[PDB]
Design a protein around this ligand. Sequence first.
Ligand SMILES: COc1ccc(C(C)=O)c(O)c1[C@H]1C[C@H]1NC(=S)Nc1ccc(C#N)cn1
Lengths: 557, 405
Amino acid sequence: PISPIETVPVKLKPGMDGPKVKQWPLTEEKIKALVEICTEMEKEGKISKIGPENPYNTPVFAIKKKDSTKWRKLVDFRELNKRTQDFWEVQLGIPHPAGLKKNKSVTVLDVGDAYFSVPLDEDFRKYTAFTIPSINNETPGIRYQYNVLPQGWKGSPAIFQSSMTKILEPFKKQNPDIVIYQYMDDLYVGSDLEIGQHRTKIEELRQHLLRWGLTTPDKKHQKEPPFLWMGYELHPDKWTVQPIVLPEKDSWTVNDIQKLVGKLNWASQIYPGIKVRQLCKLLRGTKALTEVIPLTEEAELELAENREILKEPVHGVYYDPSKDLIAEIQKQGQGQWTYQIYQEPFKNLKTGKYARMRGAHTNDVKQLTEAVQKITTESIVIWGKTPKFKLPIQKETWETWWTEYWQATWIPEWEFVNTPPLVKLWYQLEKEPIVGAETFYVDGAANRETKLGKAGYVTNKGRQKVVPLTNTTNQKTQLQAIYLALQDSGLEVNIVTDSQYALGIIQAQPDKSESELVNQIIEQLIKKEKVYLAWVPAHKGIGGNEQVDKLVSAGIR
Amino acid sequence: IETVPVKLKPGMDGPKVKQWPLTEEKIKALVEICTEMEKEGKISKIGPENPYNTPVFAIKKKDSTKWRKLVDFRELNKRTQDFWEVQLGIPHPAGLKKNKSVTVLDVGDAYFSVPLDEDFRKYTAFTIPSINNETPGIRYQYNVLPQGWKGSPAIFQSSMTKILEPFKKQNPDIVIYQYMDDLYVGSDLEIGQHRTKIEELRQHLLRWGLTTPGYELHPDKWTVQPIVLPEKDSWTVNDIQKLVGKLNWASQIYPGIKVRQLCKLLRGTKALTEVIPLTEEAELELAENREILKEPVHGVYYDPSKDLIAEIQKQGQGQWTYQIYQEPFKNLKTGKYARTNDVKQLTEAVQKITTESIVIWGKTPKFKLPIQKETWETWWTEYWQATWIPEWEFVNTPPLVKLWY
Ligand SMILES: COc1ccc(C(C)=O)c(O)c1[C@H]1C[C@H]1NC(=S)Nc1ccc(C#N)cn1
C-alpha cells in the first residue's frame, strides 16, 4: 500500500536548484530490465509517468542480484542528496541491553517495503525524476518520478521513522502497558502478558498498521527470542554479546591485532577483567595492515588471560527500576581500571573499563575521579539515574586530596571497599620549610641557538654542583636542576626554584608521567621523607637564586 | 497583536547543538511542562524537517518544589546579537550600581503572550530526550516569545514601557532595569519603603497579567578585595621571599609598587628557616605598596566594545576568589566568595558574580572555570537557579592562587 498518512514537506537547500544529471547510455539487457521493473512499480503507485517539461534528471543503473538471478534498480542520488535540506537525526544513541526492563513476552515484527509505503511530498517529487534510455539514445525515453520515499535518498530514514511514530502514537496510548521500539524496518514489541494475551496484542497492532498501509509478517514474526541485535544476543531472561572467538594463529598481522582488539573491547561490556593494554601497545607506530607483529611476553600473557576469561560464558541481567544501582571500581594494571555495575550482589547489569590517560603527569586519585565521572554519565544515559559508588580509596586519602587541590572536584555518594590495590597519594609536599634542612637553590639555563645548558644548584652549606647538558629546552635545565637537588641530597630538603613550570608539575603530586625525567623526580620524591618546594622570580637577582644563577649562566648561556 | 520580523546575523545559520543527557525525574518534569505549554499553544510538536536544536534543562524555582523549564539559548543569542543589541537594544542605567537596594523580579511569563514571527519559530527547536534512547525524542518549537532568548526582551520592550509608565511617573527616583527575563528595581529608600514600593509595582504588573516572586541586592555595599600582604610578628627567609614574589607580580599591575628597597634585603644563600631582622625603608615600602594595591588600577576603564571575563580560583576551605577584567591582569573588580559540594559552591559563585556583573555593566562575563569540563556539565544544573546562562570555558588555574587576585 501507500500510507494514508499526511506528508512531510521537504525542500532543497536555499540557493540551490534540483538535480540535472545526464543519463549515461545503458545496454539493451539493462534497458529492458528497468522497463520490466518500473512498469511494475508504476502499476502500484510508487512512480508516475511524466514528460520532458521536467528539467530534473537523476542517473539510473541496474546490477544483477545473487549469482545474477534478477536485476536491481540503483538510483545514484548523490546530486539530489546534496541539494536536499538537512534533517534531524534518526537515532542519537543506541539502547543498551542493560537498560531494558526484564520482559516476559517479546516479538519482532518487521515492516515490509517501508520507504515505498510512505507518500513523498508532492512538491518534491518533481526532483526525483529519472529516465530509461532508448537503445543507443535515439528515442527520447521513458521519464518517471516518485510518489513515495526513494531508497537512497537523504530524507527517507528521517521521514519514515517520523511517520511510523505518528502511526504508532494511537496504539501506544490505547496500550500503555506495551513497549515498542523502532529500529529501521524492524519493530520490537515486548510486554509482561502471556504468549496468548501477547500474540493477541500483536495482531491488534499488525491490524492497526494495516489500517495505515503497513504490511507485516504473520507466522514469520521472527519473535523467537534468542535475538541477535546490534552485536548482542538477547534472551527474555538475560543478555550478553554475540559469541566471541579468538583466532589462535601462529603469526599476527596488524590487521589481526585490530580485529582482536575490537572483539575484546566489545566483549568488555559484560566480561569483567578484559585487558588490551599490552596488545594495543603493539599497534603503536605506523605499520602496514599486512605486516607481521611479534607478540611480546607481556602481550603474550595478556592475550592469555583474555582467552581464559572468554571460555566460560558470562551473561548480563536486566534493569529493575525499583532497586538501587551500585557500581564498583577496581584498579587493574597501571592506569587501567575496570568496573561493574549491578543491583544485586554480583549479578552484573553491565561491565566496563576505563584506561584513558588525560595529559602527561597524573595520579590515581585523579584517574579514579575521571572514571567515576565517566561511569556517572554512562549510568545517566542508560538508566536515567546515578549509582552509588564503591571505591578502593580511603575516605581519608580522598578527603585530603580534594581539599588541597586547586581544581574543583565533586563525587557522588560512595563507600570505601577494601578491594586491593588501594588508591593512595605516594607523597606529600610539606607546607612549611624544613628547619635545619639543607636548602638547595636550583636553577638552569640553555642557549636557544645551541641547546647547551648547565643545570646546577647551590646550597646554604657551601656545596655547589653544576653539570652541563646537551640538546635541552630551558625547561629541562630547570627540571633537571631539581632532579640534582634531589639526588645528592638527604631525606629532608628544601628546594627553591624559579621554574613555575616545574613548580606546577610537581605541586600536583603526579605519580606517573610521560616525561622520562619527571618519573625519575617522582622516584626520588617517594624516597624522601620531607620535601619543601618554593618559588621566587627567576633572574630577578634575589638572595641565593642570583648566586646559583651566576655559575649556571656563566658562559654557555 | 502584529508580530516583529526577526533575522539572524546573515552568514550564520540556526542552532544545531546537542542535548546533554538528563536524569529520569528531569525528563518526566519536562514532559509535563511541555505537555501543558502545548495544550496552551505556546509550543508546537515538530517533524524531522527541522534540522535545528537547542538544549533544555529542568531547574528549581527559588528553592521550591516546582520544576521549571530552562532552555539554553546561548548559541541562538549569538546568531541573533545584532538584532537584540543594536537594532532594538535596552539602555543600562549607571544609577543602578549605586543604589542602596535592588530587587529582582522574574517577569518571564510576560513573554508567553506575544507571538513570535512564524518565519523564526524553526530556530527555537529543542528536544526532550528519552532514557536509554528507547525513543526518538520529543521535538517542539516556540510559537510565542521564549524565555532564554535575549530577543524576547527587545521585542517586549514596547509593552513593558507602557505597563511601567504610571509607576515611573509617580516614582521618578526608582531605577528600573530590564535584563533578559528579570527586572531590576533599585532605590535609595529605607528597606521597608523600598520593599513597599516593590509591592506597589507588582500591582501594576498584576493588572497586565503578571505574577511575581523577593530577593534583594545591596550594590552600594559591594567593595573590592585588596591584594593582601602579611603583617607577622616574626619573620623567616621564606616568608620574605614569598613577600617579594607577590610584590613582583603586583608590578605589572598597579604601577608604582617599588620592591627594590625590600629586595636585596638579607641575601646571599641562607637557610629558609633562618629568621631575620627588619628595615626602615622596608616598613615604608610595604606601606606605600599596599596603599596602592588597596585601590583600583589607575588606567583601567570598562570598554563597552570588549568582552568581560571572570576568572575564579579555589582558595580552599570554601573560599573562592574572582577577578573580572577585559585585559588580563587589568582587574575592573576583584572579590571573594565564602561559605557544601565543590561544584555547588562554584555554581553559587558563578551566579553571584554574573549578577553583580549585570548590575554594574549590563552584560554577563565569560567564565574561566577551575574544573573538569565533564564534571561541570554533569552537575551544574543541579544547583543552578538563574534564568540565564553565561558563556564559560574550563581553565586550569596556575599556581597563581598565591596572590589572591
Ligand atoms: C529500548 O527498546 C528496546 C531495544 C531493543 C530491543 C531488542 C534488541 O529486542 C527491545 O525489545 C526493546 C523494547 C521492547 C523492549 N524490551 C524490553 S523492555 N525488555 C526486553 C527484555 C528481553 C528481551 C529479549 N530477548 C527484549 N527486551
